[PDB]
Design an enzyme around this catalytic site. Structure first.
Site, PDB file in Angstrom:
ATOM      1  CD  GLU A 120      62.189 -93.161  34.592  1.00 61.18           C
ATOM      2  OE1 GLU A 120      61.687 -94.231  35.045  1.00 61.18           O
ATOM      3  OE2 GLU A 120      62.469 -92.946  33.382  1.00 61.18           O
ATOM      4  CB  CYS A 143      53.521 -93.834  30.755  1.00 58.05           C
ATOM      5  SG  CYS A 143      54.874 -93.943  29.540  1.00 58.05           S
TER       6      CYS A 143
HETATM    7  C1  HEM Z   1      59.955 -95.373  25.478  1.00 58.74           C
HETATM    8  C2  HEM Z   1      60.468 -94.726  26.527  1.00 58.74           C
HETATM    9  C3  HEM Z   1      59.674 -94.487  27.775  1.00 58.74           C
HETATM   10  C4  HEM Z   1      59.838 -93.455  28.665  1.00 58.74           C
HETATM   11  C5  HEM Z   1      60.838 -92.319  28.563  1.00 58.74           C
HETATM   12  C6  HEM Z   1      58.862 -93.631  29.713  1.00 58.74           C
HETATM   13  C7  HEM Z   1      58.693 -92.748  30.786  1.00 58.74           C
HETATM   14  C8  HEM Z   1      58.029 -93.120  31.947  1.00 58.74           C
HETATM   15  C9  HEM Z   1      58.278 -92.568  33.214  1.00 58.74           C
HETATM   16  C10 HEM Z   1      59.296 -91.487  33.503  1.00 58.74           C
HETATM   17  C11 HEM Z   1      57.454 -93.171  34.084  1.00 58.74           C
HETATM   18  C12 HEM Z   1      57.358 -92.928  35.583  1.00 58.74           C
HETATM   19  C13 HEM Z   1      58.255 -94.026  36.137  1.00 58.74           C
HETATM   20  C14 HEM Z   1      58.523 -93.891  37.597  1.00 58.74           C
HETATM   21  O1  HEM Z   1      58.362 -92.795  38.164  1.00 58.74           O
HETATM   22  O2  HEM Z   1      58.934 -94.886  38.246  1.00 58.74           O
HETATM   23  C15 HEM Z   1      56.724 -94.151  33.349  1.00 58.74           C
HETATM   24  C16 HEM Z   1      55.759 -94.941  33.925  1.00 58.74           C
HETATM   25  C17 HEM Z   1      55.135 -95.905  33.137  1.00 58.74           C
HETATM   26  N1  HEM Z   1      55.277 -96.169  31.819  1.00 58.74           N
HETATM   27 FE1  HEM Z   1      56.571 -95.406  30.638  1.00 58.74          FE
HETATM   28  N2  HEM Z   1      58.047 -94.632  29.389  1.00 58.74           N
HETATM   29  C18 HEM Z   1      58.549 -95.298  28.317  1.00 58.74           C
HETATM   30  C19 HEM Z   1      58.066 -96.478  27.705  1.00 58.74           C
HETATM   31  C20 HEM Z   1      57.015 -97.230  28.222  1.00 58.74           C
HETATM   32  C21 HEM Z   1      56.575 -98.471  27.690  1.00 58.74           C
HETATM   33  C22 HEM Z   1      57.184 -99.209  26.521  1.00 58.74           C
HETATM   34  C23 HEM Z   1      55.512 -98.879  28.464  1.00 58.74           C
HETATM   35  C24 HEM Z   1      54.699-100.119  28.321  1.00 58.74           C
HETATM   36  C25 HEM Z   1      54.476-100.661  27.118  1.00 58.74           C
HETATM   37  C26 HEM Z   1      55.306 -97.875  29.457  1.00 58.74           C
HETATM   38  C27 HEM Z   1      54.312 -97.908  30.393  1.00 58.74           C
HETATM   39  C28 HEM Z   1      54.475 -97.227  31.592  1.00 58.74           C
HETATM   40  C29 HEM Z   1      53.679 -97.602  32.766  1.00 58.74           C
HETATM   41  C30 HEM Z   1      52.600 -98.710  32.842  1.00 58.74           C
HETATM   42  C31 HEM Z   1      54.108 -96.768  33.736  1.00 58.74           C
HETATM   43  C32 HEM Z   1      53.643 -96.709  35.166  1.00 58.74           C
HETATM   44  C33 HEM Z   1      54.544 -97.662  35.951  1.00 58.74           C
HETATM   45  C34 HEM Z   1      54.182 -97.683  37.417  1.00 58.74           C
HETATM   46  O3  HEM Z   1      53.025 -97.368  37.775  1.00 58.74           O
HETATM   47  O4  HEM Z   1      55.055 -97.997  38.257  1.00 58.74           O
HETATM   48  N3  HEM Z   1      56.188 -96.868  29.239  1.00 58.74           N
HETATM   49  N4  HEM Z   1      57.015 -94.036  32.016  1.00 58.74           N
HETATM   50  C1  LIG Z   2      59.072 -98.900  30.864  1.00 57.64           C
HETATM   51  C2  LIG Z   2      59.637 -97.829  31.755  1.00 57.64           C
HETATM   52  C3  LIG Z   2      60.305 -96.743  31.189  1.00 57.64           C
HETATM   53  C4  LIG Z   2      60.832 -95.803  32.076  1.00 57.64           C
HETATM   54  N1  LIG Z   2      61.479 -94.712  31.611  1.00 57.64           N
HETATM   55  N2  LIG Z   2      60.689 -95.934  33.413  1.00 57.64           N
HETATM   56  C5  LIG Z   2      60.039 -96.971  33.988  1.00 57.64           C
HETATM   57  C6  LIG Z   2      59.975 -97.127  35.466  1.00 57.64           C
HETATM   58  C7  LIG Z   2      58.990 -97.760  36.115  1.00 57.64           C
HETATM   59  C8  LIG Z   2      59.064 -97.941  37.593  1.00 57.64           C
HETATM   60  C9  LIG Z   2      60.111 -98.757  38.055  1.00 57.64           C
HETATM   61  N3  LIG Z   2      60.295 -99.006  39.362  1.00 57.64           N
HETATM   62  C10 LIG Z   2      59.455 -98.489  40.279  1.00 57.64           C
HETATM   63  C11 LIG Z   2      58.378 -97.677  39.903  1.00 57.64           C
HETATM   64  C12 LIG Z   2      57.521 -97.149  41.024  1.00 57.64           C
HETATM   65  C13 LIG Z   2      57.514 -95.614  41.175  1.00 57.64           C
HETATM   66  N4  LIG Z   2      58.756 -94.859  40.865  1.00 57.64           N
HETATM   67  C14 LIG Z   2      56.066 -97.638  40.919  1.00 57.64           C
HETATM   68  C15 LIG Z   2      55.900 -98.848  41.793  1.00 57.64           C
HETATM   69  C16 LIG Z   2      55.266 -98.766  43.043  1.00 57.64           C
HETATM   70  C17 LIG Z   2      55.158 -99.926  43.813  1.00 57.64           C
HETATM   71  C18 LIG Z   2      54.496 -99.906  45.163  1.00 57.64           C
HETATM   72  C19 LIG Z   2      55.677-101.130  43.328  1.00 57.64           C
HETATM   73  C20 LIG Z   2      56.298-101.155  42.075  1.00 57.64           C
HETATM   74  N5  LIG Z   2      56.809-102.304  41.582  1.00 57.64           N
HETATM   75  N6  LIG Z   2      56.397-100.026  41.338  1.00 57.64           N
HETATM   76  C21 LIG Z   2      58.166 -97.407  38.522  1.00 57.64           C
HETATM   77  C22 LIG Z   2      59.519 -97.953  33.151  1.00 57.64           C
END
Ligand code: HEM
Ligand SMILES: Cc1cc(N)nc(CCc2cncc([C@@H](CN)Cc3cc(C)cc(N)n3)c2)c1
Ligand code: HEM
Ligand SMILES: Cc1cc(N)nc(CCc2cncc([C@@H](CN)Cc3cc(C)cc(N)n3)c2)c1
Ligand SMILES: C[C@H](O)[C@H](O)[C@H]1CNc2nc(N)[nH]c(=O)c2N1
Ligand SMILES: C[C@H](O)[C@H](O)[C@H]1CNc2nc(N)[nH]c(=O)c2N1
Ligand SMILES: [Zn+2]
Lengths: 404, 405
Positions: A285, A108
């Site tokens: 994203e 994240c």
């Molecule tokens: C507040 C604004 C936030 C921004 C801009 C942000 C940004 C991001 C981005 C860009 C990613 C990669 C997502 C992807 O490529 O699909 C991400 C992943 C993640 N963020 Fe955030 N984040 C935010 C808030 C949060 C919050 C509130 C949580 C949980 C309490 C969180 C937990 C995570 C987790 C667990 C992932 C990994 C998700 C995955 O493996 O698919 N983030 N974050």
């Molecule tokens: C809280 C939050 C803030 C923010 N700015 N962006 C996010 C997006 C999270 C996210 C949403 N869909 C898909 C993903 C993908 C990889 N891009 C990770 C993933 C991989 C796989 C195999 C399953 C799954 N559900 N998710 C991540 C979450």
């Protein structure tokens, strides 16, 4: 050995000593690094030591490390596990654990915000109907008319005896993806399977490119139930471009709220199989991944043709030029609609500040470089030049098997 | 499933298993506890014989004579040589195989589809700095080939017990000087400040331009390095212009044609070739994004964005992204115009995906460093971004080695 961590742009070095607090193995071994893999390949004392470690983390965070409250809380946890094989968190512990899971999330880039998380305790939830109400309140709170606020709602933890509470959707807001037996997908190809599941559980499908999916919510050992989100709950932003008029005509839109709903929250050895969390988007994203991925909406070519670019050759950099414009359109459209969004430059700059705060605060920060560096303009952001150490600290958000 | 790393391509949904990693004899920097994949540089007697045996087995497998009398005779000949001298020597065909294999093995190289087409110059008879220079000049002329670039490596004598090493002091055969200014800024390439000052200390008369080609500091065993100026007509450069932005030419930017790495150690069967410069052709993002736009390199993004009249006072205009794209286009366009080989990052990554498929069939995997393979702009627009990769060290290998000073 603690890793030396260098920033190659600035020449500064730190040492990560936080990684010594890691208790779970990642996928790497000395023979081979698996750091680019998206998903992992695959007792009472074990629960008790995670519990105690978490209780210790909690009281240390309130400066009460060793207080009467601390010792009596450890005794409670001990007594409850010895008797029941499990235990329950206090609300204050849950709140602390949820923030810490976010702080610990290596993937994240938005962790500068980790301290500002609204935690909804929905552990008194007993039916899919109730989960729906809690989810609705979550979206309403988180959305806040476009002034997005980070939130998590925590549903009851996993219990030895029973099935899990699960939200079947991977996000609370997802667009349908309808397959045609001529291969192609209408809508979001990432959501074909959850779309099919929804239809199969009696959802009447649309036939649009941007049809918001209903939720499939599952209470323990029950068929999941279907709940259409009230249209008014789901804020969407039509996409326009500040200078290209035809861009509107594309009919593109995206929803305001990124709310992950398929991840497991682990706190103190307890597992919360439904704990959807949401923040706000980073524009890449939407602009780069969701709209330009070849296996997503895949609009690069369309935008490039409209921009009248030479599409016949990669060396015209038509993909790069179209990508930039689409990312610009997302930023502009969100700004126009007054919906919180962060561009990847601002986000990565805040992340570098986060790395600095965490170095001081804990002697390191787990970070997954492949996920932190944005999918366009990588080396133009500071995080590209920053070495990062990736490791698992608990509380953590983890992936879990799909419930079907 | 299979007991090897499962490797997924998320664009195509396809899976492979990497079985080649089983051949790795050397630990990388990661542990189950923490991944250090993103660090740039993470931290003999019977030892040599074991590496030599393994290398000889690889050579004989690759010529399909594994287990043969010639293979067992070579093994014995190596053991005898080591037994009486502490070292051994490669046959010419072993060196060629070993150099190509080192390239094939290089996890950070996206250009490996070309690995089979490598001209190996054997310079193991070299015995002075003057001669190294001739060989290098020859390498450069061959490799440059008036813009139709050809991959090549020149191999200087291996490191030997007692005797000092052949070293090229420069990190590349062609580098631009970086001159520390009074105010603390750098004219030219900040990457090259140290090598520039060493060139001056060793008697080079510095220029004061932004694109002064550095002389070579060549060290023959147990001698002070000697300074050699590359004759200018040997170093092909490309002035940069943009296909539509007519003012871009006025920036006076240029880059040289030949990327020739000169400070890596080539290790084959335990033998160490401390001077073994190799060259390919550029991928355009190396010039346009890294060399010209890195904030710690020429750092030109802001100058270009300002000429493009972009809004440089806010990140959300994406001025950096728009300017980078135009610089990268200028690089591609200018090399094209000049008829100097260059590959754009889309074409390079597509060819690397093909390389991965080839190596999956040929060897059951391909060591690849994702962070390095994914280009520095537009990463997820390329197919490699979506491809999981397994990174491990195989030998023969190109390895970093400490600076000779
Ligand atoms: C507040 C604004 C936030 C921004 C801009 C942000 C940004 C991001 C981005 C860009 C990613 C990669 C997502 C992807 O490529 O699909 C991400 C992943 C993640 N963020 Fe955030 N984040 C935010 C808030 C949060 C919050 C509130 C949580 C949980 C309490 C969180 C937990 C995570 C987790 C667990 C992932 C990994 C998700 C995955 O493996 O698919 N983030 N974050
Ligand atoms: C809280 C939050 C803030 C923010 N700015 N962006 C996010 C997006 C999270 C996210 C949403 N869909 C898909 C993903 C993908 C990889 N891009 C990770 C993933 C991989 C796989 C195999 C399953 C799954 N559900 N998710 C991540 C979450
Ligand atoms: C034929 C055209 C080639 C292309 C397009 C190419 C592409 C690249 C690129 C883009 C990098 C990353 C460089 C950086 O970020 O600084 C690289 C690294 C590398 N390539 Fe190549 N390559 C080519 C030929 C070669 C040859 C001929 C060799 C050796 C025989 C080679 C071995 C290497 C090695 C060892 C690295 C790692 C360098 C380091 O860690 O600093 N490649 N390649
Ligand atoms: C053969 C070849 C083809 C091609 N297209 N490109 C190359 C470039 C090689 C290269 C050029 N400058 C710099 C590098 C840097 C990291 N960007 C790698 C590096 C880092 C350090 C600390 C030392 C060192 N010797 N090398 C690598 C080589
Ligand atoms: C194979 C590779 O790990 C995969 O494509 C990753 C790369 N980096 C990423 N980074 C982010 N933020 N999100 C992603 O989904 C991915 N995907
Ligand atoms: C910190 C990080 O490892 C470093 O900036 C890397 C990232 N990826 C790279 N990729 C290539 N091809 N070349 C590089 O120099 C780098 N630098
Ligand atoms: Zn690793």
């Amino acid at each position: 050995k603690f890793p030396r961590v260098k920033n190659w742009e600035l020449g500064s070095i730190t040492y990560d000593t936080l990684c010594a607090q890691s208790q779970q193995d990642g996928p790497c071994t000395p023979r081979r690094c698996l750091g680019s893999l998206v998903l992992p390949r695959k007792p009472a004392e074990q629960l008790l030591s995670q519990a105690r470690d978490f209780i210790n983390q909690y009281y240390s965070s309130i400066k009460r490390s060793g207080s009467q409250a601390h010792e009596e809380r450890l005794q409670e946890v001990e007594a409850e596990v010895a008797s029941t094989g499990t235990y329950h968190l206090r609300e204050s512990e849950l709140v602390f654990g949820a923030k810490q899971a976010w702080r610990n999330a290596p993937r994240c880039v938005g962790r500068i915000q980790w301290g500002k998380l609204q935690v909804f305790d929905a552990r008194d939830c007993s039916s899919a109907q109730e989960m729906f109400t809690y989810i609705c309140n979550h979206i309403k709170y988180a959305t806040n008319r476009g002034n997005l606020r980070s939130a998590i709602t925590v549903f009851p933890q996993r219990a030895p005896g029973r099935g899990d509470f699960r939200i079947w959707n991977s996000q609370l807001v997802r667009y349908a993806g309808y397959r045609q037996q001529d291969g192609s997908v209408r809508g979001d190809p990432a959501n074909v399977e959850i779309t099919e599941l929804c239809i199969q559980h009696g959802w009447t499908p649309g036939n649009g490119r941007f049809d918001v999916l209903p939720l499939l919510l599952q209470a323990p050992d029950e068929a999941p139930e279907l709940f259409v989100l009230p249209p008014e709950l789901v804020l969407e932003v039509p996409l326009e471009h500040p200078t290209l008029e035809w861009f509107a005509a594309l009919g593109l839109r995206w929803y305001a709220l990124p709310a992950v709903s398929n991840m497991l929250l682990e706190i103190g050895g307890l597992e919360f199989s439904a704990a959807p969390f949401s923040g706000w988007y980073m524009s890449t994203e939407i602009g780069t991944r969701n709209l330009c991925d070849p296996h997503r909406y895949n609009i690069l070519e369309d935008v490039a043709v409209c921009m009248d670019l030479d599409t016949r050759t990669t060396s015209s950099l038509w993909k790069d030029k179209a990508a930039v414009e689409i990312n610009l359109a997302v930023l502009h459209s969100f700004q126009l609609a007054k919906v919180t969004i962060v561009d990847h430059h601002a986000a990565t700059v805040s992340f570098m500040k986060h790395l600095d705060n965490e170095q001081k605060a804990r002697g390191g920060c787990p970070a997954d470089w492949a996920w932190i560096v944005p999918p366009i303009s990588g080396s133009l952001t500071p995080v590209f030049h920053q070495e990062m150490v990736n490791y698992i600290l608990s509380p953590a958000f983890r992936y879990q098997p799909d419930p079907w």
